[PDB]
Protein: Dihydroorotate dehydrogenase (fumarate)
Organism: Trypanosoma cruzi
Amino acid sequence: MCLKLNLLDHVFANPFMNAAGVLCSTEEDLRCMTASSSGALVSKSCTSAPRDGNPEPRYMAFPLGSINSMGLPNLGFDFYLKYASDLHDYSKKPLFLSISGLSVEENVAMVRRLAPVAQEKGVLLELNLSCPNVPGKPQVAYDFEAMRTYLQQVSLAYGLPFGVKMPPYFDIAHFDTAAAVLNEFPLVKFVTCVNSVGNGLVIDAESESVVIKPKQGFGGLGGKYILPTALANVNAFYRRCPDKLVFGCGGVYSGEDAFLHILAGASMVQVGTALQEEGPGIFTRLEDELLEIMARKGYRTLEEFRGRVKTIE
Amino acid sequence: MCLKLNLLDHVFANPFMNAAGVLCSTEEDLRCMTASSSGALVSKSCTSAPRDGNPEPRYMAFPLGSINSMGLPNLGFDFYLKYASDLHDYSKKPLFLSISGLSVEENVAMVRRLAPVAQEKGVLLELNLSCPNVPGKPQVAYDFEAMRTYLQQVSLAYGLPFGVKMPPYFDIAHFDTAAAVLNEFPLVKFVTCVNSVGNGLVIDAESESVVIKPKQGFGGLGGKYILPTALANVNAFYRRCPDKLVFGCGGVYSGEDAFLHILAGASMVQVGTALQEEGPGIFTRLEDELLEIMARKGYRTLEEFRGRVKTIE
Ligand SMILES: Cc1cc2nc3c(=O)[nH]c(=O)nc-3n(C[C@H](O)[C@H](O)[C@H](O)COP(=O)(O)O)c2cc1C
Ligand SMILES: Cc1cc2nc3c(=O)[nH]c(=O)nc-3n(C[C@H](O)[C@H](O)[C@H](O)COP(=O)(O)O)c2cc1C
Ligand SMILES: O=C(O)c1[nH]c(=O)[nH]c(=O)c1CCc1ccc2c(C(=O)O)cccc2c1
Ligand SMILES: O=C(O)c1[nH]c(=O)[nH]c(=O)c1CCc1ccc2c(C(=O)O)cccc2c1
C-alpha cells in the first residue's frame, strides 16, 4: 500500500504537489516546499523581467475558496532558472518550473535557455497558457490560433518533453477543439487542469465592497467553488488525450478530493488555495487521508483506480 | 416598508422569482409558484413540440449546490402559451415565458405567436441563448455571430421588449464583445445572468460513479459553487448595459445573497437550486432576510443600493 509514481522519467513519493503561484515565489518558499512531504514542487510562473504585480489587496480567502488578481508578481526568469541549476536538491523531489511569458517571443526566449538545464538537471517545464496575450483578446488558451502558435514555437525552441497549464472550459466544443490542438504536439507530455476560474466577483455584505483592489474586484476563483469544474476538465482531457498525462488541480482539501481527481484520470494532484490557507503540513494529511480511503477499498497503488470513474447504465 | 418595484411596465411585490426550469414545467408547478410569495414567475424553457428529455438520474443536489442535464424536458410551447393566455392570474403576479428553441427558425415560429398574447395579456419573453447547437460548434452565446442572428431574427419577429438568458463568461474580452452584441438591440431590455455553469462533473467517492446518467455525468452547476461567477456577470453587464435591466441568477440561498446580487446591479433576483431544494416557502424567508439587512443598514429602497458595490481606490 503506497502512493508512489513514475512518470516523465521521474520517481515521485506521492502525487501531491503545490499549485503554481502558491508557496513558490522565493528561495524561502521553494526550500520550504522541498522540506515538505509534497511529492513534487513547481515555481511561481515567470516572466523574463522581475515583476511586482498588481496593487494590494490582491488575494483573499473564505470558507469556500479564494479570489486573486496578483498580476504575475515574480523574481524573473533568471532567478528560477538559477534555482533549477544551482539551488534545488533533486534528490529530495523533482522540480517543475512554470513559465508565463506575456508574448510568444518572451516564452520562446526563456525555454531556449531552460533547455540545457532541463536536459542536464532534469527540471520539468509547465508552460502557463492560462495567461494574457494582447489586451482586448481572450486569455491564450481560449484563443485556439494563439494556442497553436505558442506550442509550435515553444516545441521548436525547447525540443524536450513539457506540459501545459490550462484554464477551465465549460462547453463540449471547446473541450473538443482544445484537446485536438494539443494532440498535434507530441512533446506536450502532460496537461494541467485547471487554472483559476476566471473573473469571478466576491462582494462583502457588511462593507458592501469588492474584496480585492485590482480589476474592480474581479479575479480568479479557486477552492471548493471550482471542484466539479476541475473534475470535468481533468476527465475531459483524460478521455481525449490518451498519449498525454493529466495533472489535476482544483479545490483539493482532503484525501477524498484527491481521490476523486485521480478517479477522473489525474496522475499528479496540485494544491492551491487549500495550501495557501493551511500551509505545507497539508501534504501529510492529504497522504494519510487518501491512504485511509485506499485501505477501506482495498486499493494498493494509484493506477488501480486512475481513470476508473464509473458512469451510469 | 415593502420591497415593491416597477419594471418593464409591471408591478412586482418584490424582486424574487424562480429561475427558469425550477417548479415551472407543469400547470401544477405554475399554480404553486403563483400561490407563493414570489413577486414573479417564469415558465420552463420550451420548444415547439413536447420533449421527454434525458434519462434519469438527470439532476442532483448536495450541500454546496446542484448539477443537471435535464435535456429541456417541457410540455411544448402550445401548453405554455395556453397557460399565459387563459390560465394565469395576472392580478397575482406577472409572468415571464422562457423559450429555448433548437434553431432560429423554431424561435421565430414561437415569438410571432407569442407577441399577440404579450400585447393582449402582458406576459414577458425570456429568450434562452443557453442551448443547442450542436455538436461540432459552441452554444449560441459563446458564438457571437450566431447570437446576432438569433437577436436580429427574434427582434424582427416579436417586436416588443424582451430579455435574454445568458450563460456565464469568464474572460473580460467576452464581457466586452458579448455586451456590444446585446447593445445593438433596443428590444433586449433585460439580461439574466447567469445560466448554470456549463459542463461540471460531480463524482461520488463511495460508489466511484458519476451522479447523473446523461453525458457520462457531465452537467450544469448551480448553487453555492457559482455565486461569485453570477455576481461577476451581473455586475459586468450592469456596467456595460446602462439602458438595460439586469436580473441576477445564481446561488441565492439567503437575503444576503440577494443583497449582494442587487449590489452588483440586479433588478430581479432569481432562485433556482435553493428553490428546488427547499420549496416555495423560501420566498417568505428570502424576503424577511433581505428586509432585515436593509433595516439594519438604513436602506428604505432597492434603488438606494442597486449597482452600488464599492471598488477599492
Ligand atoms: C495566489 C495564487 C497565485 C497563483 N499563481 C499562479 C501562477 O503564477 N501561475 C499559474 O499558472 N497559476 C497560478 N494560480 C492558479 C493555481 O495554480 C490553481 O490553478 C487555482 O488556484 C485552482 O487551484 P485550487 O482550487 O487548489 O486553489 C494561482 C492561484 C492563486 C490562488
Ligand atoms: C433542474 C434545473 C432546470 C433548469 N432549467 C432551465 C431552463 O429550462 N432554462 C433556463 O434558462 N435555465 C434553466 N436552469 C438554469 C437556472 O435557471 C439557473 O440559471 C441556474 O440553476 C443557476 O441558479 P441557481 O444558482 O440558483 O441554481 C435550470 C437549472 C436547474 C437546476
Ligand atoms: O498572477 C496571477 O494573477 C495569476 N493568478 C492565477 O490565478 N493564475 C495565473 O496563471 C496567474 C498568472 C497569469 C496571469 C494572470 C492574470 C494577469 C493579469 C490580470 O488579469 O490581472 C495581469 C497581468 C498578468 C497576469 C498574469
Ligand atoms: O433543461 C436543461 O437541461 C437545462 N439546464 C440548464 O441548466 N440550463 C438550461 O438552460 C437548460 C435548458 C437548455 C438546455 C441546456 C442544455 C442542453 C443540453 C446540454 O447542454 O447537454 C442538451 C440538450 C438540451 C439542453 C437544453
Notes: The first strand of chain B starts at residue 5 and ends at 7. Residues A 21, 45, 54, 68-72, 100, 128, 130-132, 195-196, 214-215, 220 surround W6Y (ligand 3) (CB under 6 Å). The domain at 54-71+197-222 of chain B is CATH 2.30.26.10 (Dihydroorotate Dehydrogenase A; chain A, domain 2). The two ends of chain B are 34 Å apart (CA to CA).
